[PDB]
């Protein structure tokens, strides 16, 4: 954790240690009167809020890259799709065809007089 605003770092790769690798992420932070565009980490940090939902964390804990995932969910609407909707699309129409016939047998045909073998 540097104190100034100037950071100097170097790599010494004189020979076959050349294949060594390292990558960093510095973050410009301010003294802990965080006022605006400053999500206050509890580690003396006032970071800029352009680095929110960016994936890369800037504080020790992932404070800034946390609670950025929002969707909408339900009950049986979890499976309403192209694949699982093949059964609910057909079998809710099978019951509907059986219900139009059952009204047609009930209304046009009574239950009483003389109707053996009828429909």
């Amino acid at each position: 954790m540097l104190k100034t605003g100037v950071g100097v770092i170097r790599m010494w790769a004189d020979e076959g240690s050349r294949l060594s690798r390292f990558r960093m992420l510095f973050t410009s932070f301010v003294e802990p009167p965080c006022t605006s565009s400053t999500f206050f980490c509890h580690s003396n940090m006032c970071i800029n809020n352009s680095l929110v939902c960016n994936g890369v964390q800037n504080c020790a804990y992932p404070w800034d890259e946390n609670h950025c995932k929002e969707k909408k969910k339900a009950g049986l609407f979890e499976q309403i799709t192209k694949t699982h909707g093949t059964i609910i699309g057909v079998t809710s129409g099978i019951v509907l065809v059986l219900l139009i016939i059952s009204i047609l047998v009930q209304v046009k045909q009574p239950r009483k007089k003389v109707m053996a073998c009828k429909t």
Partner: protein, 253 residues
Amino acid sequence: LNPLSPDIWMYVLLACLGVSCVLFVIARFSPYEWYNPHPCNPDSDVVENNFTLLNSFWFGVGALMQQGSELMPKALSTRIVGGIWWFFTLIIISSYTANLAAFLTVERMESPIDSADDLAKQTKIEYGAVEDGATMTFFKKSKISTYDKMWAFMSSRRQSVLVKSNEEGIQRVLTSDYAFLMESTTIEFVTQRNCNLTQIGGLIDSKGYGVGTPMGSPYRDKITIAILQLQEEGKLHMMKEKWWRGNGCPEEE
């Protein structure tokens, strides 16, 4: 409503309107349900049918809620619809009331940590202690198979987890995912005020407070005769029940 999934509650209802409309069409089509309604007058022609659409639908609802309706099928074509709706609703009810035993008493969702070694393995739950403390000094100077490993974390992330008060140790647990190693007499005060915090382990060590005097003082004996006089009289417990009282906190079960 839980022990069956919210789709399979709809496959019951489509079957309860499905079978109750298949039973109606077969009972009108079959020439053996059309019976003579007069036993005492056999040789007449008033041949009727007792399957309406009310009579067919509350057969399918009557056999689903295990009570049953009057409506008994008489032809062989409708005793196979009725006989397989009884086996359908025998398996639905028996699978419901067996799974419902698991959604009333199965367990409580316990904390992922339960002791010191459950922090020693689970690197998801973050540690914590206070800087300038006898807790931090305890893990810095102990070596028994866990407490060096717990200090293997906090030495590497000293700017992260080690805080400067007991107040910041409360706030990091209230906000972050933190497991602050507090002394066990201010855990017995904070958990009395905040009913959303807890002591998840036992006591790691055993120590105690003091009225510390300089090295070679004529008071370390005059204070402990006064402390033990306050402890035999029980006055060190009227003072602890006064301040560690709290606002009360439910155990609730």
